Amino acid sequence: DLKLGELLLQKGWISREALEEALVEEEKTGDLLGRILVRKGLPEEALYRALAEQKGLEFLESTEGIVPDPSAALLLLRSDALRYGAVPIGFQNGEVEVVLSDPRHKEAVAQLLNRPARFYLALPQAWEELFRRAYPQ
Ligand SMILES: Nc1nc2c(ncn2[C@@H]2O[C@@H]3COP(=O)(O)O[C@H]4[C@@H](O)[C@H](n5cnc6c(=O)[nH]c(N)nc65)O[C@@H]4COP(=O)(O)O[C@H]3[C@H]2O)c(=O)[nH]1
């Protein structure tokens, strides 16, 4: 398994000098690497695509075509969907389909769901739009 920086290098979306500059700053700041890379010019979608591939998630280019299944939304309390950044949207072959806001949460969510699941990753704005449609307040 590759680290995020190596992944982006392999995909040609950052240079080695950009990575080394980010990693030297990270050693001096503690900030998340992806956050530093984006601040320095990496497209945020480049970040999420690499983060998706790293955690074995399907990157969702859009959430606009998704009609959330109310049955699937019941599998998580709204407050949990929010804090875990997970939207269950439907079912496929006996697995629940779940759209995450942060790939670092995949394991915490998968353990909670305790059932076969298919995980997707969406950009922040797209995720929030999907969450509000799935969990009206
Ligand atoms: N939602 C979100 N998740 C993010 C972001 N940036 C990184 N991550 C994810 O969070 C984990 C922790 O990243 P880190 O704190 O910067 O800690 C990283 C970083 O300090 C460092 N390092 C990361 N990439 C490289 C690299 O390419 N070369 C070298 N020498 N060190 C690296 O290794 C540690 C673990 O790397 P990873 O396996 O890739 O594990 C990463 C990665 O899966 C972000 O901006 N948003």
Numbering used by the authors: 165 to 301
The authors write:
One target protein for c‐di‐GMP is PilF, a hexameric ATPase from the thermophilic bacterium Thermus thermophilus important for pilus formation, cell motility, and DNA uptake from the environment. The N‐terminus of PilF contains three homologous so‐called general secretory pathway II (GSPII) domains, GSPII‐A, ‐B, and ‐C. Our recent structures of GSPII‐B (PilF159‐302) showed that the two nucleotide building blocks of c‐di‐GMP are recognized by the protein in a very similar manner through a duplicated amino acid sequence motif. In the GSPII‐B complex with c‐di‐GMP, both c‐di‐GMP phosphodiester groups accept a hydrogen bond from a backbone amide group of a conserved leucine (L168 from the first motif and L197 from the second motif) and from a side chain amino group of a conserved glutamine (Q190 from the first motif and Q218 from the second motif).
To gain insights into the structural basis for the pH‐dependent ligand recognition, we crystallized both the Q190E and the Q218E single‐site mutant of the PilF GSPII‐B domain in complex with c‐di‐GMP using very similar crystallization conditions at pH 7.0. Due to the high‐quality electron density maps for both mutants, their ligand recognition mode could be discerned in detail. In both the Q190E and the Q218E single point mutants, one phosphodiester‐binding pocket can be found in the mutant configuration and the other one in the WT configuration due to the duplication of the c‐di‐GMP phosphodiester binding motifs. Importantly, the carboxylate groups of the newly introduced glutamate sidechains in either of the two Q/E mutants were found to still point directly towards a non‐bridging oxygen atom of the phosphodiester groups for the carboxamide groups of the native glutamine side chains. The shortest distances between the oxygen atoms of the glutamate carboxylate groups and the phosphodiester groups were found to be 2.6 Å (Q190E) and 2.5 Å (Q218E), respectively, which is well below the sum of the van der Waals radii of the two oxygen atoms. Finally, the lengths of the hydrogen bonds from E190 to the 2′‐OH group of c‐di‐GMP in the Q190E mutant and from E218 to the 2′‐OH group in the Q218E mutant are increased by 0.4 Å if compared to the native sites in both constructs (red numbers). While the c‐di‐GMP binding affinity of the WT protein is similar at pH 4.0 and 8.5 according to ITC titration experiments, both mutants display a drastic increase in ligand affinity at lower pH. The affinity of the Q190E mutant for c‐di‐GMP increased ∼ 20fold with the KD changing from ∼ 800 nM at pH 8.5 to ∼ 40 nM at pH 4.5. Fitting the KD’s measured over a pH range from 4.0 to 8.5 to this formula yielded pKa values of 7.5 and 6.3 for the Q190E/c‐di‐GMP complex and the free Q190E mutant protein, respectively.
